[PDB]
Amino acid sequence: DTITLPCRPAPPPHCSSNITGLILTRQGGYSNANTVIFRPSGGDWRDIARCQIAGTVVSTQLFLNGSLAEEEVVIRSEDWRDNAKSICVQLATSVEIACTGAGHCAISRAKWANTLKQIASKLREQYGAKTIIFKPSSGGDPEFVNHSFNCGGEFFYCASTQLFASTWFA
Amino acid sequence: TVVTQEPSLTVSPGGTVTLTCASSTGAVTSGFYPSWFQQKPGQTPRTLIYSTNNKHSWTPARFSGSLLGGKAALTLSGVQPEDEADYYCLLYYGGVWVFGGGTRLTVLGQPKAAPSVTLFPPSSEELQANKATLVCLISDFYPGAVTVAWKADSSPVKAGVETTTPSKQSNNKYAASSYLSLTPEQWKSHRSYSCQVTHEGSTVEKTVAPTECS
Amino acid sequence: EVQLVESGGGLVEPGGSLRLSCAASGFNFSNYGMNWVRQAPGKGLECISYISGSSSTKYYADSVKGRFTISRDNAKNSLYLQMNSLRDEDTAVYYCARDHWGLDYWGQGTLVTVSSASTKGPSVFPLAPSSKSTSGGTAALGCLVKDYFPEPVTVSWNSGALTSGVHTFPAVLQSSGLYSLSSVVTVPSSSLGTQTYICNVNHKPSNTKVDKKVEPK
Ligand SMILES: *[C@@H]1O[C@H](CO)[C@@H](O[C@@H]2O[C@H](CO)[C@@H](O)[C@H](O)[C@H]2NC(C)=O)[C@H](O)[C@H]1NC(C)=O
Ligand SMILES: *[C@@H]1O[C@H](CO)[C@@H](O)[C@H](O)[C@H]1NC(C)=O
Ligand SMILES: *[C@@H]1O[C@H](CO)[C@@H](O)[C@H](O)[C@H]1NC(C)=O
Missing domain, CATH: 2.60.40.10 (Immunoglobulins)
Known part of the structure; x- marks a missing residue:
């Protein structure tokens, strides 16, 4: 059972990659009782650059083939109390995203759910809440509202909405 | 902060040449997002490689970016005579782009011709x-x-x-x-x-x- | 298609001011940072300045700090470089480059010449094809662009339709301080009387457009 991210154009099979991390943005509200909302960061490439874990692969929202963390998932941010400051989440165990060439790539829903749970646990330890809600990207250009990546000299765009739509409790 | 390239390199057609790009501030990692530009005489610089090794659609297949010994490396394998140009290396220092000195690449295989x-x-x-x-x-x-x-x-x-x-x-x-x-x-x-x-x-x-x- | 077009440039007296503009098309201009990168004649590339998409972050090179000011109007898709206190070291071709994982798209570049000299438009004289330059049914004909300043001039043929044979030569720095070049083309000599050849010279630094026709004999 897998999550299917639809991609345009169809990514060839040799573009299958390893999600080693991602970049998030917390939705405005600070203390909304106990539910904190995060979304995939759709800002500037320099945010991904300031994360400094993305590796050599050009990618938005999700870091492909980047550097993984040593022991456990680690979240970082210039300022936790600021929403404009992005959240660089470095995974500990990569999640393989496999592309078939049929216009969509696939991610194991069990592995992605475990990754989301670990991310939510670390975000809960940081922001001191309980409920973590991953919501989709709140608009922008095609390169940052979608998960985009350059492979084989071609830029591919994949709707990552089904990766960021879940609730995680304590 | 100085970004250093070889001043000139010479290669025969069909051969292989490797241009190196070193940073005075430590070793070049993937976070320096190196780019390689090709400037033929009087032309606008043209991006061949970005982010260590990514290519554009217009980048020829024979060009390849890489990283060796803390230096960025542009490898031209199977050189063609029109590959003769100036190759500038561009490094990223936390928001500050810094160009290299450039490398004049001469394809040493041009037949002598009368004017x-x-x-x-x-x-x-x-x-x-x-x-x-x-x-x-x-x-x-x-x-x-x-x-x-x-x-x-x-x-x-x-x-x-x-x-x-x-x-x-x-x-x-x-x-x-x-x-x-x-x-x-x-x-x-x-x-x-x-x-x-x-x-x-x-x-x-x-x-x-x-x-x-x- | 991503397009970046520079305007401004030309001749500026030392100590004077200038403003380079860069019009962008084919992309959401507000969604990308911009860079000014200059190149002195015969020298390497130098990244001058960077402005963020929201014009919130501006980086300047040490050589141009305090003198140059980068700006942008997103509603007008325009990038601006206000150059003040210009020195002889600022004479260069100035390129406008988008900031997308590097400098992926550049402008055509605009030449800024810092000289106390004066702007002077070209004088175009046709180099007619005669029985001197007819070798094997091929007639060589051109136009001389003499005494002009500053650089450069763009010379096309037949409104920019001749493509083949057009070789425009570099200019000399004459003893007078003015430039001058030649632009020739070899065509079939069997087309001299049936095809009209209009050498179109354009000197943007002096706003001099001149379409001089080259007639045989
Ligand atoms: C092009 O860029 C503009 C920036 O001016 C984007 O405009 C967005 O408009 C929505 C309308 O509700 C605002 O809420 C956003 O804040 C604006 N800025 C963004 C998303 O950065 C516009 O969406 C962009 N469009 C594309 C296709 O790139
Ligand atoms: C991804 O990582 C796996 C191990 O989890 C490894 O087998 C594989 O080579 C990597 N490859 C791709 C294409 O992502
Ligand atoms: C990621 O790395 C694997 C090797 O592990 C490679 O096959 C794949 O193409 C890479 N994906 C990119 C560069 O997008």
Whole structure:
């Protein structure tokens, strides 16, 4: 059972990659009782650059083939109390995203759910809440509202909405 | 903060050359987001490699970015003669782009070629404006080293001569231009003017005359 | 298609001011940072300045700090470089480059010449094809662009339709301080009387457009 991210154009099979991390943005509200909302960061490439874990692969929202963390998932941010400051989440165990060439790539829903749970646990330890809600990207250009990546000299765009739509409790 | 490249490198056609790009601030990692630009003579720099090794759609397959020993590396494997250009390396220092010195890459396999000369006499409009200029144009020669001598009738001329330094054309070969400044009086006051272009010991001469109208 | 077009440039007296503009098309201009990168004649590339998409972050090179000011109007798709206190070291071709994982798209570049000299438009005289330049049915004909300043001039043929044979030669720095170049083309001599050849010279630094026709004889 897998999550299917639809991609345009169809990514060839040799573009299958390893999600080693991602970049998030917390939705405005600070203390909304106990539910904190995060979304995939759709800002500037320099945010991904300031994360400094993305590796050599050009990618938005999700870091492909980047550097993984040593022991456990680690979240970082210039300022936790600021929403404009992005959240660089470095995974500990990569999640393989496999592309078939049929216009969509696939991610194991069990592995992605475990990754989301670990991310939510670390975000809960940081922001001191309980409920973590991953919501989709709140608009922008095609390169940052979608998960985009350059492979084989071609830029591919994949709707990552089904990766960021879940609730995680304590 | 200095981004250092080899000043020049030379490679035969079909061979393999590796350009290196070193940073004074430590070793070059994937976070320096290296880019490699190719600038042919007089052209706008053109991105070949970005983010260590990503290619654009217009990047030839023979170019490849990489990282060796804390240096960025652009590898051109299977060099073609049109790959002769200047390759600038661009490094990223937390929001600050810094270019490299550049590398002049010479594809050492250009066959020697004799210069093509064309000499134009002063036009009607220039002569009527009390000026005269003979234009001796040289093209399609390699190596790019010529010498130009001017002749009034048959004796050498030394005053009023202005010659370019040769500049590579779009065919890797060189081209130059030579101008002889005269007054229209001394243009018609002599029977012919001759341009002698000496290249690799061989001289090609062209000649025009004032009485040769139409 | 991503397009970046520079305007401004030309001749500026030392100590004077200038403003380079860069019009962008083919992309959401507000969604990308911009860079000014200059190149001195015969020298390497130098990244001068960077402005963020929201014009919130501006980086300047040490050489141009305090003198240059980068700006942008997103509603007008325009990037601006206000150059003040210009020195002889600022004479260069100035390129406008988009900031997308690097400098992926550049402008055509605009030449800024810092000289106390004066602007002077070209004088175009046709180099007619005669029985001198007819070798094997091929006639060589051109136009001389004499005495002009500053650089450069763009020379096309037949409104920019001749493509083949057009070789425009570099200019000389004459003793007078003015430039001059030649632009020739070899065509079939069997087309001299049936095809009209209009050498179109354009000197943007002096706003001099001149379409001089080259007639045989
Ligand atoms: C092009 O860029 C503009 C920036 O001016 C984007 O405009 C967005 O408009 C929505 C309308 O509700 C605002 O809420 C956003 O804040 C604006 N800025 C963004 C998303 O950065 C516009 O969406 C962009 N469009 C594309 C296709 O790239
Ligand atoms: C991804 O990582 C796996 C191990 O989890 C490894 O087998 C594989 O080579 C990597 N490859 C791709 C294409 O992502
Ligand atoms: C990621 O790395 C694997 C090797 O592990 C490679 O096959 C794949 O193409 C890479 N994906 C990119 C560069 O997008």
